[PDB]
Write a protein that binds this ligand. Sequence first.
Ligand code: RVU
Lengths: 248, 329, 826
Amino acid sequence: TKPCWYWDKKDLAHTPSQLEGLDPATEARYRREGARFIFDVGTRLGLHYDTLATGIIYFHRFYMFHSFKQFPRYVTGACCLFLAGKVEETPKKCKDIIKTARSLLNDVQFGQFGDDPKEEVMVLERILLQTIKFDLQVEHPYQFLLKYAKQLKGDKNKIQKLVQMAWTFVNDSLCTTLSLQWEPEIIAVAVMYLAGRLCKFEIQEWTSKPMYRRWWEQFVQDVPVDVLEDICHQILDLYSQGKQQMPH
Amino acid sequence: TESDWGKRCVDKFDIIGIIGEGTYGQVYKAKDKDTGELVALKKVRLDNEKEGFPITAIREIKILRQLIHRSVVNMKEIVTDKQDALDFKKDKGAFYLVFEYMDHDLMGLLESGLVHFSEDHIKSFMKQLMEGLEYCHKKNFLHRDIKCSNILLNNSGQIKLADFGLARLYNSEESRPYTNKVITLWYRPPELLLGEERYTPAIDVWSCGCILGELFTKKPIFQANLELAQLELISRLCGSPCPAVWPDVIRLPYFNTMKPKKQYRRRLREEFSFIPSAALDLLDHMLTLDPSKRCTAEQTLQSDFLKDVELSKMAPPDLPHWQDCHELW
Amino acid sequence: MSYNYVVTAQKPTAVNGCVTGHFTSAEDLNLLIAKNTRLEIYVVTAEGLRPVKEVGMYGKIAVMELFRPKGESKDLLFILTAKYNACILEYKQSGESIDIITRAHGNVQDRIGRPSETGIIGIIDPECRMIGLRLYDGLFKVIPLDRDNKELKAFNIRLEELHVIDVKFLYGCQAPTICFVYQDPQGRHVKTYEVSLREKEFNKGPWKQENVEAEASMVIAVPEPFGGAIIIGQESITYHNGDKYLAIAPPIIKQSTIVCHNRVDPNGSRYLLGDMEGRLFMLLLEKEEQMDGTVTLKDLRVELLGETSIAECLTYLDNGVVFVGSRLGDSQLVKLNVDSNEQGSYVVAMETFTNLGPIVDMCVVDLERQGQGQLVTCSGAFKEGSLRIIRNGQKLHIRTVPLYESPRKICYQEVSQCFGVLSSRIEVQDTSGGTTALRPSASTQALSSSVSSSKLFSSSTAPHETSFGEEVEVHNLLIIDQHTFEVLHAHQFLQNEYALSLVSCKLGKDPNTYFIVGTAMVYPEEAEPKQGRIVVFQYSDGKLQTVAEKEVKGAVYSMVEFNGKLLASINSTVRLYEWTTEKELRTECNHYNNIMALYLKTKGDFILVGDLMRSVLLLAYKPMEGNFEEIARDFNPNWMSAVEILDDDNFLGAENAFNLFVCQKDSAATTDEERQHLQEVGLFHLGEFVNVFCHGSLVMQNLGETSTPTQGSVLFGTVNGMIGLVTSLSESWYNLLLDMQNRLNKVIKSVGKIEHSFWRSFHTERKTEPATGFIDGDLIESFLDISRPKMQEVVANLQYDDGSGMKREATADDLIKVVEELTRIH
Ligand SMILES: COc1ccc(C)cc1N1C[C@@H](C(=O)Nc2nc3ccccc3[nH]2)CC1=O
């Protein structure tokens, strides 16, 4: 019926790129640059946050089946965003995506697009569609962050601070392979959990069951803390590696 | 696995012929070589290279892999032409959308005058259609192209809705700007004639009511070639758009611009006096000018006409296939 | 685009209706015989009928009734066309000048309504206060006959009874009253209402509802001496009037369904009744007068008079002359005698009026070795079945060959100097367990005979029960001599086997010329036949030999010879068979994308297929590959009655809605989709039902070849006997003739003031379109009959084109010559 789009962390050492001699750090870097390229390009074009995420998910899934050495990432990213726009009904003309990419990429980076940028992108759409197995509908942590937050009752300012901090953590998780390991519902809970720890909030009181200490079990069944902690660790690693710090 | 679409080749189907023309490509009828099941292939030509894979097809692939209902056509898989070996840039081959083959289409059966519907037949037909629309409307999807041509009917009496090329999600909270002119003029709702541009899911209901009438008369209820003339035909039967029956009609872009000859009174019950009362009530509610007072799909299923209909008895329509060639003597 | 020309070679001959009254003058008695689109007016004399006037109308005549409102000296004529054009007409004569006056007219079509099963019904009040029309289920339309209603404006009264069988205005009522038989789930009933023009609604009727026979069919309005109504069924005749109720159920009428009725005596004492087997009955009202002075109806009696042609309509005329208006056979004048003849009959035929009847099939053959083809048509049905030989003489010479059974298909085998004809006769289950024919006919009067002994379906094990009295069709192949037209041989097909297709041809390397028949096993239980045969016969030395048989899994609706191979259509499948050196059929290739492959035509390696729906498909045999290829299909949904190939790029079709269309290969090549799409470039409302298209012409070539501007010749036969001809034009000639039509329509006065452009508009209940690509030759040929002032008015400011003359002026004499050349095509 429907395909399985989730791998185990251990399985990511056997991506096609890893097996062509790319080391883990490099593939992670390539994944962040490609995702952020998709994000920056679409933000310039005025695209909805779901459209940006869908492209990034297409991008991340693509390089679980292909190697970064044979498919230049920024062409792939541009193609993903182009298709994402048609899927999410925020369409853009390929020529416009190319133009914006030229502004953000330096001359060497734009070299990936070769002599005819539009053609290299349009030609890839076939491989993208076959690779994603024509499963174009994607759900993102954003909708669940809001669906769950709506069920919280309490200080409006304290909850809104929780939501925005978690929302930032969602945007930051798109640069990682978390999208390829855990369903979006878990990501939304994980980012609520992380923001709660950082803001020293006890979310349980805002839920309908105030003595239910595992507050998330009323939104997402069967999620151990082991999982939520693994996700939190992965999100904060991006902040510690970079120069950026937790939003608070 | 069954889920890895886009790889299996169209070699696996023996093409029987071309069963129609479609927006993105020509539609073919095929028999599966392995199972012998009859299917329908929609050719998606991405060779245009203007904007790539047609969005109309993207909508049908995105939506019909989510929707599972008896009254909603099932896309079985997506297959491809023999692809060029190791040269995707040269590859210009097309993709085919596989669907379960349906014996007949409503417009085909009605245009050929080969179909006659009894009340019980209309009940079974409408119940399936409206139940399918309810499934889609509950999933917050809008069809936006409800025509007789897009209703496929098997000889068993099963009905399936089909062309989801103009279908898009509806958000009640956020009013979204939509394409104003979306349904064929004969089945277009009044709001879109006056240019709402932010339509409700009630656009699809108005269409199904036009079909309800057509099943009783065997002729479309409002057939016109110009948007104003359609409003006139609608206005004569359903009444002229006026603030009393449609309080927000004044906010519509063309309400002052597009006017009927007169302020016609509603005559639906009179002109359809031959329709049964249980149905006539349904028609009056389905063909209500104000989208906010137009009945919902669920409300139609909880109507005296369709509620106590049991779909175990499909009640298949009258399709004579012999002695129809000979002439009544 | 495409340009074509359509003319009538023979006008419709079947009688659709007949009325008697005083239309031409209050003193004269007239008989108005109506044929499709044609009205014939006669004056009743003592020897027979005197023709006075014939007019055409731009519409199929659906209702024809004569009425005389207070203040008029003579009867007026009401006509309603099948496209709902209504009008009131008057006869006016000024010495030698006869014309028809349109007194009132209009179109009464409703935007919303369901057409009724029993068709349009029209009746007029005995006081001529209103015209009643039953056009749609659940609605009764009233046109009040006031002096001011020159537009025939009307209103609808809601009718609770949705399914109405028949309705008449009653006699002797205080208000206008309707009596009708209707059907609901509980059976059939007879009911009355009163019609109020003041209130524009129904009021309670004079007498109560009564449950009537399940197959009650016709309502008779009995005149004032008796009053009330008579209801005719399959088994019983009943009289109803308030408290009075009578019923006679004589066993003689149960045998055959009664289709027509007419009043003989104006007092209502005697009526004529007719049934499908041709028997004419007298229905007698036996009076009883009470000392009160009031006359009551005592009893009903039915008396058999004799036999006529199967009659759609009857009219009593005067004396013993009765007009038998026949749609299936020849119409007649017959005399009713008081004394029976030595055979027991009171009916003796006087005159016989040719009716080409339903033309089921036809072939064009040069029998007399001339330069012209003679048209042998399969005409008539049941006891009226006949073969008609038609040759051009200025009139058409027609020879009639009676068969007394239904002809179905005809083909010509020159090698055998004979014709092969498929026929079916009706037998009835009898007490022996077998069946008995109602009369001898061609298949039983053959010189030599044979019966199929095939064992193909003999395994059976499928039960089909028989009840005494039920009808069956028995199908035969008739070998008929081309000079004597004597039945030389009759071959009877299997029980329940229908003969649907016939061809005469040579196959493969086989030098023998065969008769090949395609059949279907027809069981009442089956929705679509699932068994069938293709049978190869050889007619040799007075005997038909069975050469080979091929079993198929369906009905062989159509077959055609294809370059030494046999092309046959079995249900959905279109198949090509080869003829082996072992004299057996071998399948080469098939095509399956069809709903029902009812019709086949070929030209070269191209095949035109016409389905029950989805119009026509252009197939091609690819000899390099040994298969079929779909070249181009018409995607417009149409119900086909006949198809023909005009040229390698144009294709002709006939719809079940009495419409003609032409599809052209798009002949562009940018996209494959464009080639695969056949564009309907011609649309034309013929007004006739076309069964058979046939290449050929009845005109005899004077010497060599002489050609008018028209190129090509397709003849077609219709259900009403009308024979027409379709031919092609050049763009220059079309435009000239089209521009002239528009000029002629402004000049010529139409009966009923019916717009010609409306009449020829393509019409289905769902779609109506302006005609295109077709020249109404019958309009063009009328230029020669309009007065000189009108001719010159037509040619004013008329320019020629696309020729060596560039833009040429036209004079009245120039066009008279052009039309006369067009009149020579037939
Ligand atoms: C032998 O039949 C045909 C031959 C030629 C023509 C021109 C049409 C027909 N047909 C096929 C039927 C159909 O439309 N079938 C369908 N269309 C689908 C679209 C999407 C999914 C499934 C579908 N199944 C109705 C009909 O008359």
